[PDB]
Amino acid sequence: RVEVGPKTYIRQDNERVLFAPVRMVTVPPRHYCIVANPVSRDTQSSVLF
Amino acid sequence: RVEVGPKTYIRQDNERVLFAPVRMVTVPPRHYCIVANPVSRDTQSSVLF
């Protein structure tokens, strides 16, 4: 699962952090991007775990 | 927390098992025992976590 934001959220020992904090994807105006295997979304288009 | 019964319940990695399965305390008829720092109990005298 994702962990995001200006938090110093320490990992639990049961958890494992695979990588250093990757930059959140930025999408410039008048630009586009495509991602395979997208997360599902509802009518609110909220992420659905 | 306790884990008891004829189960092959494997430990989770986050969990740690301090010791080998100690025998459940046996209390013979016409005998008695006393334990300091008893677990709390309700009106049902069920264990209260």
Side-chain angles (χ1 to χ4, degrees):
Chain A
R1 66 182 182 275
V2 65
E3 294 301 321
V4 64
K7 59 182 66 180
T8 183
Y9 175 77
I10 61 172
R11 64 182 181 89
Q12 289 79 359
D13 180 67
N14 297 131
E15 293 178 350
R16 182 177 64 84
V17 177
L18 276 67
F19 57 87
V22 176
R23 178 64 176 85
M24 292 171 67
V25 175
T26 60
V27 287
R30 293 174 295 181
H31 293 81
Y32 64 92
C33 58
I34 296 170
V35 173
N37 291 281
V39 294
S40 65
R41 292 177 179 83
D42 58 352
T43 59
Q44 187 62 58
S45 296
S46 296
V47 178
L48 296 176
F49 296 96
Chain B
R1 66 182 182 275
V2 65
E3 294 301 321
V4 64
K7 59 182 66 180
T8 183
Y9 175 77
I10 61 172
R11 64 182 181 89
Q12 289 79 359
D13 180 67
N14 297 131
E15 293 178 350
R16 182 177 64 84
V17 177
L18 276 67
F19 57 87
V22 176
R23 178 64 176 85
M24 292 171 67
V25 175
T26 60
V27 287
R30 293 174 295 181
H31 293 81
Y32 64 92
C33 58
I34 296 170
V35 173
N37 291 281
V39 294
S40 65
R41 292 177 179 83
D42 58 352
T43 59
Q44 187 62 58
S45 296
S46 296
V47 178
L48 296 176
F49 296 96

XYZ file of all heavy atoms in Angstrom:
792
model
N 0.830 -1.199 0.000
C 0.000 0.000 0.000
C 0.869 1.256 0.000
O 2.025 1.231 0.434
C -0.954 0.011 1.195
C -0.284 0.125 2.550
C -1.324 0.072 3.656
N -0.741 0.227 4.984
C -0.221 -0.771 5.692
N -0.207 -2.002 5.198
N 0.285 -0.539 6.894
N 0.303 2.344 -0.508
C 1.011 3.612 -0.630
C 1.163 4.327 0.713
O 0.324 4.196 1.604
C 0.283 4.549 -1.630
C -1.088 4.941 -1.096
C 1.125 5.779 -1.954
N 2.254 5.075 0.850
C 2.436 6.011 1.949
C 2.959 7.320 1.371
O 4.016 7.347 0.741
C 3.394 5.452 3.001
C 2.868 4.227 3.732
C 1.561 4.493 4.454
O 1.413 5.589 5.034
O 0.682 3.606 4.442
N 2.217 8.400 1.590
C 2.479 9.655 0.896
C 2.203 10.858 1.802
O 1.379 10.782 2.713
C 1.619 9.749 -0.393
C 0.137 9.798 -0.049
C 2.023 10.938 -1.254
N 2.902 11.963 1.553
C 2.709 13.181 2.319
C 3.928 13.583 3.127
O 4.850 12.790 3.302
N 3.933 14.825 3.634
C 5.041 15.374 4.425
C 5.124 14.779 5.825
O 5.270 15.514 6.802
C 4.709 16.865 4.495
C 3.227 16.917 4.381
C 2.855 15.809 3.437
N 5.038 13.458 5.914
C 5.088 12.773 7.196
C 6.393 12.007 7.376
O 6.964 11.491 6.415
C 3.891 11.833 7.336
C 3.804 10.763 6.260
C 2.560 9.910 6.445
C 1.297 10.725 6.211
N 0.065 9.910 6.390
N 6.858 11.944 8.619
C 8.039 11.167 8.967
C 7.625 9.762 9.397
O 8.227 9.164 10.291
C 8.858 11.853 10.083
O 10.042 11.091 10.356
C 8.030 12.023 11.355
N 6.603 9.240 8.728
C 6.000 7.961 9.082
C 7.009 6.819 9.065
O 7.418 6.348 8.004
C 4.843 7.654 8.127
C 4.214 6.296 8.328
C 3.340 6.062 9.381
C 4.483 5.250 7.455
C 2.762 4.822 9.565
C 3.911 4.007 7.632
C 3.051 3.800 8.687
O 2.477 2.563 8.866
N 7.414 6.389 10.256
C 8.336 5.269 10.401
C 7.673 3.958 9.998
O 6.485 3.747 10.248
C 8.867 5.152 11.847
C 7.718 4.920 12.829
C 9.649 6.396 12.230
C 8.171 4.599 14.235
N 8.438 3.082 9.357
C 7.935 1.763 8.998
C 7.806 0.856 10.219
O 8.633 0.903 11.130
C 8.846 1.111 7.957
C 10.257 0.829 8.452
C 11.119 0.222 7.361
N 12.469 -0.075 7.832
C 12.826 -1.222 8.399
N 11.934 -2.189 8.567
N 14.077 -1.405 8.798
N 6.764 0.034 10.232
C 6.670 -1.059 11.191
C 7.600 -2.186 10.757
O 7.881 -2.340 9.567
C 5.226 -1.548 11.322
C 4.303 -0.566 12.035
C 3.834 0.568 11.143
O 4.207 0.648 9.974
N 3.015 1.454 11.694
N 8.085 -2.964 11.719
C 9.035 -4.032 11.426
C 8.431 -5.101 10.521
O 9.132 -5.698 9.703
C 9.535 -4.676 12.722
C 10.528 -5.797 12.472
O 11.645 -5.513 11.990
O 10.189 -6.965 12.753
N 7.131 -5.339 10.664
C 6.439 -6.287 9.800
C 6.401 -5.796 8.359
O 6.443 -6.585 7.415
C 5.022 -6.533 10.308
C 5.002 -7.171 11.681
O 4.300 -6.712 12.582
N 5.777 -8.235 11.849
N 6.322 -4.480 8.202
C 6.358 -3.850 6.891
C 7.775 -3.756 6.346
O 8.743 -3.738 7.108
C 5.733 -2.461 6.953
C 4.243 -2.471 7.223
C 3.676 -1.075 7.335
O 4.475 -0.116 7.398
O 2.438 -0.935 7.353
N 7.894 -3.696 5.025
C 9.186 -3.466 4.394
C 9.074 -2.396 3.313
O 8.195 -2.459 2.454
C 9.738 -4.763 3.800
C 11.106 -4.613 3.153
C 11.636 -5.949 2.657
N 10.803 -6.508 1.597
C 10.914 -6.187 0.311
N 11.828 -5.311 -0.081
N 10.109 -6.746 -0.584
N 9.968 -1.414 3.368
C 9.986 -0.332 2.393
C 10.946 -0.656 1.253
O 12.165 -0.640 1.430
C 10.391 1.005 3.038
C 10.478 2.098 1.985
C 9.406 1.384 4.132
N 10.385 -0.956 0.086
C 11.172 -1.421 -1.050
C 12.121 -0.369 -1.619
O 13.149 -0.714 -2.200
C 10.247 -1.921 -2.166
C 9.741 -3.364 -2.075
C 8.795 -3.556 -0.899
C 9.075 -3.787 -3.377
N 11.786 0.907 -1.458
C 12.555 1.954 -2.124
C 12.472 3.327 -1.463
O 11.565 3.607 -0.681
C 12.103 2.068 -3.582
C 10.634 2.340 -3.746
C 10.146 3.635 -3.742
C 9.740 1.294 -3.911
C 8.798 3.883 -3.893
C 8.391 1.537 -4.064
C 7.920 2.834 -4.058
N 13.436 4.177 -1.805
C 13.474 5.559 -1.340
C 12.312 6.350 -1.938
O 11.899 6.080 -3.064
C 14.807 6.200 -1.706
N 11.785 7.330 -1.184
C 10.598 8.105 -1.570
C 10.658 8.683 -2.982
O 11.264 9.731 -3.203
C 10.575 9.234 -0.539
C 11.230 8.653 0.654
C 12.290 7.725 0.142
N 10.027 7.987 -3.924
C 9.930 8.446 -5.303
C 9.064 9.701 -5.392
O 8.065 9.822 -4.683
C 9.357 7.336 -6.217
C 9.149 7.838 -7.637
C 10.277 6.127 -6.212
N 9.455 10.631 -6.260
C 8.694 11.855 -6.478
C 7.307 11.542 -7.025
O 7.159 10.692 -7.901
C 9.452 12.776 -7.440
C 8.744 14.076 -7.799
C 8.564 14.975 -6.588
N 7.962 16.258 -6.942
C 6.654 16.470 -7.047
N 5.799 15.483 -6.828
N 6.201 17.672 -7.376
N 6.296 12.230 -6.503
C 4.935 12.080 -7.002
C 4.891 12.535 -8.451
O 5.522 13.532 -8.805
C 3.957 12.886 -6.147
C 3.776 12.348 -4.736
S 2.824 13.468 -3.691
C 1.211 13.381 -4.454
N 4.161 11.803 -9.290
C 4.147 12.098 -10.718
C 3.573 13.483 -10.970
O 2.529 13.842 -10.430
C 3.326 11.052 -11.501
C 3.226 11.440 -12.968
C 3.950 9.675 -11.359
N 4.258 14.254 -11.807
C 3.808 15.594 -12.141
C 3.284 15.626 -13.568
O 3.924 15.117 -14.486
C 4.935 16.627 -11.981
O 6.028 16.282 -12.840
C 5.426 16.659 -10.543
N 2.114 16.224 -13.748
C 1.532 16.354 -15.074
C 1.343 17.820 -15.467
O 0.423 18.495 -15.005
C 0.202 15.580 -15.174
C 0.476 14.091 -15.225
C -0.684 15.878 -13.980
N 2.239 18.320 -16.324
C 2.238 19.695 -16.833
C 0.987 19.995 -17.646
O 0.424 19.086 -18.251
C 3.485 19.744 -17.719
C 4.371 18.677 -17.180
C 3.435 17.581 -16.766
N 0.529 21.252 -17.628
C -0.637 21.645 -18.422
C -0.386 21.433 -19.913
O 0.744 21.609 -20.367
C -0.798 23.133 -18.102
C -0.168 23.294 -16.760
C 0.994 22.341 -16.754
N -1.431 21.049 -20.642
C -1.323 20.693 -22.055
C -0.334 19.548 -22.253
O 0.489 19.568 -23.166
C -0.916 21.909 -22.896
C -1.982 22.994 -22.959
C -1.490 24.236 -23.685
N -0.392 24.893 -22.981
C 0.206 26.002 -23.403
N -0.187 26.584 -24.529
N 1.197 26.531 -22.700
N -0.432 18.548 -21.380
C 0.390 17.345 -21.460
C -0.423 16.140 -21.008
O -1.500 16.294 -20.433
C 1.653 17.477 -20.607
C 2.620 18.503 -21.108
N 2.475 19.850 -20.856
C 3.754 18.377 -21.838
C 3.473 20.510 -21.415
N 4.264 19.639 -22.017
N 0.085 14.941 -21.271
C -0.659 13.729 -20.954
C 0.251 12.555 -20.605
O 1.446 12.573 -20.900
C -1.569 13.351 -22.125
C -0.830 12.997 -23.395
C -0.487 11.681 -23.679
C -0.469 13.978 -24.307
C 0.189 11.352 -24.837
C 0.210 13.660 -25.467
C 0.536 12.347 -25.727
O 1.212 12.024 -26.881
N -0.329 11.539 -19.973
C 0.406 10.332 -19.607
C -0.534 9.136 -19.513
O -1.732 9.294 -19.277
C 1.138 10.527 -18.279
S 0.069 10.958 -16.896
N 0.013 7.939 -19.694
C -0.787 6.721 -19.644
C -0.135 5.681 -18.735
O 1.074 5.456 -18.805
C -0.986 6.125 -21.052
C -1.780 7.092 -21.931
C -1.708 4.790 -20.977
C -1.821 6.698 -23.391
N -0.941 5.050 -17.886
C -0.439 4.047 -16.953
C -1.212 2.732 -17.048
O -2.429 2.698 -16.864
C -0.499 4.554 -15.499
C -0.144 3.440 -14.529
C 0.439 5.737 -15.316
N -0.491 1.654 -17.338
C -1.074 0.319 -17.401
C -1.403 -0.202 -16.006
O -0.773 0.189 -15.023
C -0.137 -0.638 -18.117
N -2.388 -1.093 -15.941
C -2.923 -1.615 -14.681
C -3.305 -0.521 -13.683
O -2.789 -0.491 -12.565
C -1.912 -2.566 -14.037
C -1.750 -3.860 -14.812
O -2.577 -4.766 -14.714
N -0.680 -3.949 -15.592
N -4.215 0.378 -14.086
C -4.688 1.472 -13.236
C -5.452 0.972 -12.020
O -6.097 -0.073 -12.087
C -5.607 2.260 -14.166
C -6.137 1.244 -15.090
C -5.027 0.265 -15.311
N -5.367 1.708 -10.919
C -6.207 1.426 -9.765
C -7.675 1.677 -10.095
O -8.007 2.603 -10.837
C -5.792 2.266 -8.546
C -4.417 1.849 -8.075
C -5.810 3.748 -8.888
N -8.549 0.837 -9.553
C -9.983 0.968 -9.778
C -10.532 2.200 -9.071
O -9.993 2.635 -8.056
C -10.719 -0.282 -9.298
O -10.596 -0.427 -7.894
N -11.608 2.762 -9.614
C -12.233 3.941 -9.026
C -13.754 3.838 -9.047
O -14.332 3.163 -9.899
C -11.783 5.208 -9.757
C -10.315 5.552 -9.565
C -9.923 6.782 -10.366
N -8.522 7.137 -10.170
C -7.511 6.580 -10.831
N -7.744 5.636 -11.731
N -6.265 6.966 -10.589
N -14.394 4.514 -8.098
C -15.848 4.504 -7.981
C -16.484 5.680 -8.716
O -15.844 6.323 -9.545
C -16.261 4.520 -6.508
C -15.711 5.723 -5.762
O -14.883 6.461 -6.336
O -16.113 5.934 -4.599
N -17.750 5.949 -8.406
C -18.457 7.092 -8.974
C -17.831 8.402 -8.512
O -17.906 9.418 -9.199
C -19.946 7.084 -8.588
O -20.071 7.123 -7.161
C -20.625 5.831 -9.115
N -17.215 8.362 -7.335
C -16.495 9.506 -6.797
C -15.105 9.578 -7.427
O -14.376 10.556 -7.255
C -16.404 9.404 -5.269
C -15.810 10.620 -4.578
C -16.632 11.872 -4.804
O -17.816 11.921 -4.470
N -16.006 12.894 -5.378
N -14.762 8.527 -8.170
C -13.440 8.352 -8.767
C -12.348 8.335 -7.701
O -11.190 8.653 -7.973
C -13.155 9.446 -9.800
O -14.052 9.358 -10.894
N -12.733 7.962 -6.486
C -11.780 7.722 -5.412
C -11.108 6.372 -5.619
O -11.701 5.463 -6.199
C -12.473 7.774 -4.051
O -12.996 9.066 -3.797
N -9.873 6.242 -5.148
C -9.152 4.982 -5.258
C -9.862 3.907 -4.439
O -10.261 4.149 -3.300
C -7.693 5.128 -4.784
C -6.965 3.792 -4.849
C -6.975 6.177 -5.614
N -10.019 2.720 -5.020
C -10.721 1.632 -4.348
C -9.783 0.478 -4.011
O -9.432 -0.323 -4.877
C -11.876 1.125 -5.212
C -13.011 2.115 -5.484
C -14.033 1.505 -6.434
C -13.670 2.553 -4.187
N -9.378 0.406 -2.748
C -8.539 -0.686 -2.275
C -9.273 -2.022 -2.344
O -10.467 -2.099 -2.057
C -8.079 -0.420 -0.839
C -7.206 0.795 -0.695
C -7.748 2.015 -0.330
C -5.841 0.714 -0.921
C -6.946 3.133 -0.194
C -5.033 1.828 -0.786
C -5.587 3.040 -0.422
N 0.048 -11.658 23.920
C -1.221 -12.360 24.069
C -1.013 -13.871 23.993
O -0.037 -14.351 23.407
C -2.231 -11.906 23.014
C -1.869 -12.264 21.586
C -2.915 -11.718 20.627
N -2.646 -12.074 19.239
C -1.835 -11.392 18.436
N -1.208 -10.313 18.885
N -1.653 -11.787 17.186
N -1.931 -14.608 24.606
C -1.855 -16.062 24.672
C -2.218 -16.727 23.345
O -3.022 -16.207 22.570
C -2.782 -16.607 25.790
C -4.242 -16.329 25.458
C -2.543 -18.093 26.037
N -1.605 -17.878 23.086
C -2.009 -18.761 22.003
C -2.054 -20.184 22.547
O -1.046 -20.700 23.031
C -1.054 -18.656 20.815
C -1.070 -17.302 20.123
C -2.442 -16.934 19.591
O -3.139 -17.830 19.071
O -2.822 -15.749 19.693
N -3.221 -20.812 22.464
C -3.456 -22.073 23.155
C -4.359 -22.997 22.333
O -5.176 -22.532 21.539
C -4.086 -21.814 24.551
C -5.466 -21.186 24.410
C -4.145 -23.085 25.388
N -4.200 -24.306 22.522
C -5.017 -25.284 21.827
C -4.226 -26.162 20.877
O -3.079 -25.858 20.554
N -4.844 -27.259 20.413
C -4.214 -28.219 19.498
C -4.063 -27.680 18.082
O -4.392 -28.371 17.118
C -5.182 -29.403 19.521
C -6.502 -28.791 19.834
C -6.210 -27.664 20.784
N -3.562 -26.457 17.963
C -3.383 -25.827 16.666
C -1.910 -25.718 16.288
O -1.046 -25.542 17.146
C -4.041 -24.447 16.657
C -3.497 -23.485 17.700
C -4.241 -22.161 17.657
C -5.692 -22.333 18.083
N -6.442 -21.049 18.046
N -1.637 -25.830 14.993
C -0.293 -25.650 14.464
C -0.090 -24.196 14.050
O 0.590 -23.901 13.065
C -0.023 -26.594 13.272
O 1.328 -26.432 12.819
C -1.002 -26.336 12.128
N -0.672 -23.294 14.833
C -0.682 -21.870 14.522
C 0.724 -21.299 14.368
O 1.437 -21.094 15.350
C -1.440 -21.109 15.613
C -1.418 -19.607 15.456
C -2.227 -18.975 14.523
C -0.596 -18.820 16.251
C -2.210 -17.602 14.378
C -0.572 -17.447 16.114
C -1.381 -16.844 15.176
O -1.361 -15.476 15.037
N 1.114 -21.057 13.120
C 2.410 -20.463 12.818
C 2.463 -19.007 13.264
O 1.472 -18.280 13.169
C 2.739 -20.549 11.311
C 1.693 -19.798 10.484
C 2.824 -21.999 10.866
C 2.050 -19.668 9.022
N 3.616 -18.585 13.769
C 3.808 -17.192 14.150
C 3.936 -16.285 12.929
O 4.524 -16.667 11.917
C 5.044 -17.049 15.038
C 6.352 -17.411 14.350
C 7.532 -17.287 15.296
N 8.796 -17.609 14.639
C 9.548 -16.725 13.993
N 9.168 -15.456 13.916
N 10.683 -17.106 13.425
N 3.378 -15.084 13.029
C 3.654 -14.035 12.058
C 5.038 -13.455 12.328
O 5.514 -13.481 13.463
C 2.577 -12.948 12.106
C 1.227 -13.393 11.555
C 0.425 -14.226 12.537
O 0.876 -14.501 13.647
N -0.769 -14.636 12.128
N 5.686 -12.945 11.284
C 7.042 -12.423 11.414
C 7.106 -11.226 12.357
O 8.102 -11.032 13.054
C 7.598 -12.030 10.043
C 9.010 -11.478 10.122
O 9.936 -12.246 10.459
O 9.194 -10.273 9.852
N 6.042 -10.429 12.382
C 5.969 -9.300 13.301
C 5.909 -9.767 14.749
O 6.425 -9.111 15.653
C 4.757 -8.431 12.980
C 4.840 -7.808 11.602
O 3.893 -7.878 10.819
N 5.978 -7.197 11.298
N 5.273 -10.915 14.956
C 5.200 -11.535 16.270
C 6.484 -12.270 16.623
O 7.230 -12.693 15.740
C 4.018 -12.497 16.336
C 2.668 -11.815 16.268
C 1.529 -12.807 16.278
O 1.799 -14.019 16.139
O 0.368 -12.378 16.430
N 6.740 -12.418 17.917
C 7.864 -13.220 18.377
C 7.434 -14.161 19.497
O 6.799 -13.741 20.463
C 9.012 -12.325 18.850
C 10.242 -13.090 19.313
C 11.373 -12.147 19.691
N 11.027 -11.310 20.834
C 11.155 -11.687 22.103
N 11.625 -12.891 22.397
N 10.812 -10.857 23.080
N 7.779 -15.436 19.353
C 7.443 -16.444 20.351
C 8.589 -16.618 21.341
O 9.637 -17.171 21.003
C 7.118 -17.800 19.700
C 6.848 -18.849 20.766
C 5.930 -17.664 18.760
N 8.383 -16.137 22.563
C 9.439 -16.108 23.568
C 9.886 -17.490 24.038
O 11.027 -17.659 24.465
C 8.993 -15.283 24.782
C 9.177 -13.764 24.713
C 8.268 -13.134 23.669
C 8.951 -13.130 26.079
N 8.998 -18.477 23.964
C 9.301 -19.778 24.554
C 8.526 -20.948 23.953
O 7.493 -20.769 23.309
C 9.045 -19.725 26.062
C 7.646 -19.317 26.430
C 6.635 -20.257 26.532
C 7.344 -17.988 26.679
C 5.352 -19.882 26.870
C 6.062 -17.609 27.019
C 5.065 -18.557 27.117
N 9.045 -22.149 24.190
C 8.400 -23.387 23.768
C 7.099 -23.596 24.541
O 7.005 -23.205 25.703
C 9.342 -24.567 23.972
N 6.094 -24.212 23.896
C 4.750 -24.389 24.461
C 4.734 -24.977 25.870
O 4.831 -26.191 26.041
C 4.088 -25.355 23.479
C 4.766 -25.090 22.191
C 6.187 -24.749 22.527
N 4.613 -24.103 26.865
C 4.507 -24.514 28.260
C 3.192 -25.252 28.504
O 2.159 -24.892 27.939
C 4.617 -23.294 29.206
C 4.399 -23.695 30.657
C 5.970 -22.624 29.039
N 3.239 -26.286 29.341
C 2.049 -27.049 29.697
C 1.035 -26.167 30.414
O 1.401 -25.368 31.275
C 2.437 -28.240 30.577
C 1.278 -29.098 31.069
C 0.556 -29.784 29.922
N -0.501 -30.673 30.395
C -1.740 -30.283 30.681
N -2.085 -29.011 30.546
N -2.632 -31.166 31.105
N -0.237 -26.314 30.055
C -1.308 -25.589 30.726
C -1.355 -26.022 32.182
O -1.195 -27.206 32.480
C -2.647 -25.845 30.036
C -2.755 -25.239 28.646
S -4.238 -25.783 27.774
C -5.524 -25.009 28.743
N -1.562 -25.068 33.087
C -1.515 -25.370 34.513
C -2.607 -26.362 34.884
O -3.763 -26.199 34.500
C -1.669 -24.093 35.366
C -1.735 -24.442 36.845
C -0.522 -23.136 35.097
N -2.233 -27.383 35.645
C -3.184 -28.392 36.079
C -3.471 -28.231 37.564
O -2.555 -28.091 38.371
C -2.669 -29.813 35.802
O -1.433 -30.019 36.496
C -2.442 -30.015 34.314
N -4.749 -28.250 37.918
C -5.145 -28.149 39.313
C -5.913 -29.388 39.774
O -7.090 -29.566 39.461
C -5.963 -26.865 39.566
C -5.049 -25.658 39.532
C -7.039 -26.699 38.511
N -5.229 -30.262 40.519
C -5.775 -31.508 41.067
C -6.907 -31.244 42.049
O -6.918 -30.198 42.695
C -4.575 -32.135 41.779
C -3.387 -31.560 41.093
C -3.782 -30.149 40.773
N -7.875 -32.163 42.132
C -8.977 -32.019 43.088
C -8.460 -31.988 44.524
O -7.477 -32.664 44.828
C -9.826 -33.267 42.839
C -9.520 -33.650 41.431
C -8.068 -33.316 41.239
N -9.116 -31.202 45.374
C -8.672 -30.977 46.748
C -7.259 -30.400 46.775
O -6.418 -30.814 47.570
C -8.742 -32.273 47.564
C -10.161 -32.769 47.804
C -10.183 -34.122 48.497
N -9.599 -35.177 47.674
C -9.507 -36.450 48.047
N -9.965 -36.830 49.233
N -8.961 -37.342 47.234
N -7.017 -29.434 45.892
C -5.742 -28.728 45.823
C -5.985 -27.273 45.446
O -7.083 -26.912 45.026
C -4.797 -29.382 44.813
C -4.332 -30.747 45.212
N -5.096 -31.880 45.024
C -3.175 -31.163 45.779
C -4.432 -32.933 45.465
N -3.263 -32.525 45.928
N -4.964 -26.436 45.600
C -5.125 -25.009 45.347
C -3.842 -24.354 44.842
O -2.753 -24.913 44.975
C -5.604 -24.302 46.617
C -4.622 -24.355 47.765
C -3.693 -23.341 47.958
C -4.618 -25.423 48.650
C -2.794 -23.385 49.004
C -3.720 -25.478 49.699
C -2.810 -24.458 49.871
O -1.914 -24.507 50.913
N -3.987 -23.167 44.262
C -2.846 -22.404 43.763
C -3.157 -20.912 43.758
O -4.319 -20.511 43.690
C -2.464 -22.862 42.356
S -3.787 -22.727 41.143
N -2.115 -20.091 43.825
C -2.285 -18.643 43.845
C -1.366 -17.975 42.825
O -0.187 -18.315 42.724
C -2.008 -18.066 45.247
C -3.024 -18.604 46.255
C -2.060 -16.547 45.227
C -2.688 -18.280 47.694
N -1.912 -17.024 42.071
C -1.145 -16.321 41.048
C -1.229 -14.803 41.204
O -2.316 -14.224 41.184
C -1.619 -16.702 39.631
C -0.938 -15.834 38.588
C -1.342 -18.172 39.362
N -0.071 -14.170 41.360
C 0.017 -12.718 41.459
C -0.229 -12.060 40.104
O 0.023 -12.661 39.058
C 1.368 -12.303 42.011
N -0.711 -10.822 40.144
C -1.120 -10.077 38.951
C -2.081 -10.853 38.049
O -1.787 -11.075 36.873
C 0.112 -9.658 38.147
C 0.937 -8.597 38.852
O 0.596 -7.415 38.837
N 2.027 -9.019 39.479
N -3.233 -11.264 38.598
C -4.254 -12.005 37.854
C -4.869 -11.178 36.736
O -4.965 -9.958 36.856
C -5.294 -12.329 38.923
C -5.186 -11.213 39.877
C -3.737 -10.840 39.917
N -5.270 -11.839 35.657
C -6.042 -11.175 34.618
C -7.409 -10.755 35.149
O -8.017 -11.459 35.958
C -6.213 -12.074 33.381
C -4.873 -12.299 32.718
C -6.844 -13.401 33.769
N -7.880 -9.597 34.703
C -9.177 -9.081 35.122
C -10.307 -9.915 34.534
O -10.160 -10.513 33.470
C -9.335 -7.620 34.706
O -9.349 -7.500 33.294
N -11.438 -9.955 35.234
C -12.595 -10.712 34.773
C -13.893 -9.942 34.994
O -13.989 -9.108 35.894
C -12.664 -12.070 35.476
C -11.545 -13.026 35.101
C -11.640 -14.326 35.881
N -10.584 -15.263 35.510
C -9.353 -15.237 36.011
N -9.018 -14.317 36.904
N -8.456 -16.131 35.617
N -14.888 -10.230 34.162
C -16.186 -9.569 34.240
C -17.175 -10.361 35.090
O -16.784 -11.248 35.847
C -16.755 -9.353 32.837
C -16.906 -10.651 32.062
O -16.425 -11.698 32.543
O -17.511 -10.623 30.971
N -18.456 -10.027 34.962
C -19.516 -10.751 35.655
C -19.608 -12.187 35.155
O -20.036 -13.085 35.878
C -20.881 -10.068 35.472
O -21.201 -10.002 34.076
C -20.852 -8.661 36.045
N -19.204 -12.389 33.905
C -19.148 -13.717 33.312
C -17.867 -14.421 33.753
O -17.681 -15.617 33.515
C -19.227 -13.618 31.783
C -19.336 -14.949 31.058
C -20.592 -15.709 31.432
O -21.707 -15.214 31.261
N -20.417 -16.920 31.949
N -16.995 -13.658 34.410
C -15.666 -14.110 34.818
C -14.835 -14.549 33.615
O -13.916 -15.359 33.740
C -15.764 -15.249 35.838
O -16.372 -14.805 37.039
N -15.172 -14.005 32.452
C -14.366 -14.181 31.253
C -13.141 -13.280 31.325
O -13.182 -12.222 31.950
C -15.184 -13.875 29.999
O -16.258 -14.790 29.858
N -12.054 -13.700 30.689
C -10.839 -12.898 30.661
C -11.097 -11.594 29.911
O -11.710 -11.597 28.844
C -9.676 -13.665 30.001
C -8.427 -12.798 29.925
C -9.398 -14.951 30.760
N -10.628 -10.481 30.470
C -10.854 -9.173 29.863
C -9.555 -8.549 29.367
O -8.770 -8.017 30.153
C -11.534 -8.232 30.858
C -12.943 -8.620 31.311
C -13.448 -7.648 32.369
C -13.895 -8.676 30.129
N -9.333 -8.625 28.060
C -8.166 -8.008 27.445
C -8.211 -6.488 27.569
O -9.270 -5.877 27.442
C -8.070 -8.406 25.969
C -7.859 -9.878 25.748
C -8.932 -10.716 25.498
C -6.585 -10.422 25.786
C -8.740 -12.069 25.291
C -6.386 -11.774 25.580
C -7.465 -12.600 25.332
